């Protein structure tokens, strides 16, 4: 006898907007000689807009139901890796420079 | 006797919009001599707009139902890898420069 | 006998907006010779706008139901990795400079 | 006999807006020769705007229900990793400089 | 017999706005030769605006229900890692400087 | 019998510039009703750039030579002339002005 | 028998600049009803840039030479002339002005 | 028999600049109804830049030479001329002015 | 038989600058109804920059030479001329002024 | 037979500057109804910068030389001329002024 009543009359819903910005990794790069690494960008974002909507309707009087909703997300990482190495670089974006040297010497 | 009633009358829903930006990896790159790495970009985003909508309807009076919804996501990584190596670079985007040297010497 | 009544009459809902900024990793970089690393950016954001909406409706008088909603997120990391190494760099973005040297000498 | 009544009449809701700023990692960088590392940026933000909305409706008179909503988030990290190393750098963004030297000598 | 009545008549709600600033990590950096590290920025912020909204409705007369809502957040870290090392740097952003030397000598 | 010895070894000359601005007479004139004269603009400028250059060689031991180099310039001027005459002008570049008269009367 | 020895070894000359601004006569004139004369602009400027340059070589032992270099410049001027005459002008660049008269009367 | 020895070894000259501003006659004049004369602008400026340069070589042992270098400049001027005459002018650059008269009367 | 020995070894000259401001005659004049004369601007400026430079070499043992260098400048001027005459002017750059008269009357 | 020995070893000269301000005649004049004359501006300035420079070399043992260097400057001036005449002027740059008269009357 559980009467569930929802009455909607003469409703007027408008202008329901959700906005998100750009998600760029390596953009607008006029520089040079540069190591640029974006390592594992993970995006679980959610942009939504609900207007006059409903969810699930479960009419279960006296039910022995079982419902499992599992979302197992695995992102395990094991890193032993040299990342972003820059060595022995002569970067001259200026003008009129003279006699610029970079020397590396290694014995073993 | 679980009467579930939903009454909608003279509804007017409008302008339900959800926007997302661009997701670019390596874009607009006029620079040179540069190591640019985007390693494993994972995107589980969701852009949605619900307007006057409903979900599931489950009329189960006295049911012994079992429902399993499993979403197992695996992204395990094992990295032992030199990533983004730049070496012995002479980068001269300027004008009129003179006598620029980069020397590397290695013994073993 | 649990009468649940929701009565809506002559409602007027408008201008429901949620905005988010840009999420850029390496953008607008005119500099050079620079190691730029964005390591594991994880985004679980949520931008939403609900206007005249409802959730789930569960009419369960005297039910022995069991509902499990598990969201297991795993991001375990083990890092033994040299990240962002810059060495033996002569960076001259100025003008008219003269006799600039960078010397590295190593014995082992 | 638990009559739950919600009566809405001649409501007028408007201008419900929530805004968020940009979340950029490495942006607008004209400098050079610089190690810039953003290590593990985690974002669980939430930007929302509810206007005339409701939550879940659970009509359960005399029910023995069990509901579990678990959100297990794991971000365990083990770091033994040299991060952000800059060495043997001659940075000359000025003009007219003369006879600038950087010497490194190592024995082992 | 627990009559719960909520009566709304001729309501007018407007201008409900919540704003947040930008959350940028490394932005607007024209300097060079500088180690800039943002290590593990975690963001659990929440920007919301509720206008004429309600929460959950649970009509449970004489129920033996059990509800568990667990949000386990794990961020355990073990760090034995040299972070932000700068060594043997000659930084000359001035003009007209002369005879600038930086010498490093190491025996072992 | 004398010897003029000039020995040049391992020279490096660069970035020699000579310039000057525009020598413009009448330019960018949106005004009206004006009288403009540029009378006799005489230009004998000499914008030169000499880099590693060398002049004449006159090896003349015991010679009776006559070398005459004459540059005779004549600009003699005689003027008895009405230059730049503006008479009986009603210049109205404003807005909404009324009843503007310029009455010029002469007899003989 | 004398010797003129000039020995140049390992020279490096750079960044030699000579300049000057515009030599403009009448430019950017939005005004009206004016009288402008630039009478006889004579220019003998000499903007030179000499870098590692060398002059004439005259090896003349015991010679009776006659070298004459004459630069005769004539600019003799005789003026009996009405220059720059502005008469009977009603210049109204303002707004809303009324009843502006300029009455000029002469007899003979 | 004398010797003029000049020995230059390992020289490095740089950054030699000579400049001057604009030599402008009539520029940026939004005013109106004016009388402007630039009478006879004579320019003999000498903006030079000499870096590592050298002059003439005259190796003349025991010679009866005659060297004459003449620069005769004539600018003789005779003026009996009405220059810059402005008469009977009603200049009204203001707003809202009324009943402005300039009455000029002469007989003979 | 004498010796003029000049020995230059390991010289380094830099950053030599000579400059001066603008030599402008009539510029930036928004005023109106004025009379402006720049009569005879004569310029003989000498903005030079000498760095590591050297003059003439005259190796003349026992010679009867005649060297004449003449720079004759003539600017003789005779003026019997009405320069800069402004008569019968009503200059009203203000706002709201009324009944402004300038009456000039003469007989013969 | 004498010896003029000049030995320069390991010299380093830098940062030599000579300058002066603008030599401007008539600039930035928003005033009106004025009479301005810059009569005969004569400039013989000498802004020089000498750094490590050297003059002439005259090696003349036992010579009967005649060296004449003449710079004859003539600026002789004779003026019988009405310069800078302003007559019968009503200058009203104020606001709201009334009934301003300037009556000039003469007979012969």
Swiss-Prot record, chains A, B, C, D, E, F, G, H, I, J:
Q: Where is this cross-link: Glycyl lysine isopeptide (Lys-Gly) (interchain with G-Cter in ubiquitin)?
A: 10, 27, 40, 46, 50, 60, 72, 76, 82, 98, 104
* Modified sites of kind N6,N6-dimethyllysine: 40
Site annotated as Not glycated: where? 3, 19, 23, 27, 40, 46, 50, 60, 69, 72, 99, 104
Residues with PTM Omega-N-methylarginine: 78
Which residues does the record list as glycosylated?
A: 9-10, 76, 82, 98
Tissues showing expression:
Expressed in neurons. Isoform PNS-tau is expressed in the peripheral nervous system while the others are expressed in the central nervous system.
Q: Which disease is it linked to?
A: In Alzheimer disease, the neuronal cytoskeleton in the brain is progressively disrupted and replaced by tangles of paired helical filaments (PHF) and straight filaments, mainly composed of hyperphosphorylated forms of TAU (PHF-TAU or AD P-TAU). O-GlcNAcylation is greatly reduced in Alzheimer disease brain cerebral cortex leading to an increase in TAU/MAPT phosphorylations. Frontotemporal dementia 1: A form of dementia characterized by pathologic finding of frontotemporal lobar degeneration, presenile dementia with behavioral changes, deterioration of cognitive capacities and loss of memory. In some cases, parkinsonian symptoms are prominent. Neuropathological changes include frontotemporal atrophy often associated with atrophy of the basal ganglia, substantia nigra, amygdala. In most cases, protein tau deposits are found in glial cells and/or neurons.
Name of the featured protein: Microtubule-associated protein tau
- Stretch of the intact protein here: 589 to 696 of 758
